[PDB]
Amino acid sequence: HRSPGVFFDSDKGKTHSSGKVLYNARIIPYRGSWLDFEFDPKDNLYVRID
DNA sequence: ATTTTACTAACTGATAGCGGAACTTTGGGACACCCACAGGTTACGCGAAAATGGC
């Protein structure tokens, strides 16, 4: 399985019309909710809980 | 004279009905005081079409 912790990933420039490689960080625990920090194609940082 | 058969009456079993008591079944009640919930979740991805938002 995927180890608990924090993982930094990217969409590899395959979501938005241009390249604009979008970066995200996911905190995944053993038990509990998930935390997501993502960049939008406007260079703003957004948070998602679960 | 004897043997086979048709007729009849009695026995017996099935069955519908009833009695009645036990058994299952339904509805009501309980007066210290108690006063807003979960409840797991998700590492999908893609294309369309439908609903929102921007000025």
Curated annotation (Swiss-Prot):
Record field: transmembrane: none
Annotated signal sequence range: none
S-S pairs: none
The organism's place on the tree of life at top rank: Bacteria
Binding partners and assembly: The RNAP catalytic core consists of 2 alpha, 1 beta, 1 beta' and 1 omega subunit. When a sigma factor is associated with the core the holoenzyme is formed, which can initiate transcription.
Function (record text): DNA-dependent RNA polymerase catalyzes the transcription of DNA into RNA using the four ribonucleoside triphosphates as substrates.
Family: Belongs to the RNA polymerase beta chain family.
Name recorded for this polypeptide: DNA-directed RNA polymerase subunit beta
Native source species: Vibrio cholerae serotype O1 (strain ATCC 39541 / Classical Ogawa 395 / O395)
Gene behind the chain: rpoB
Part of the whole protein covered: 150 to 199 of 1341
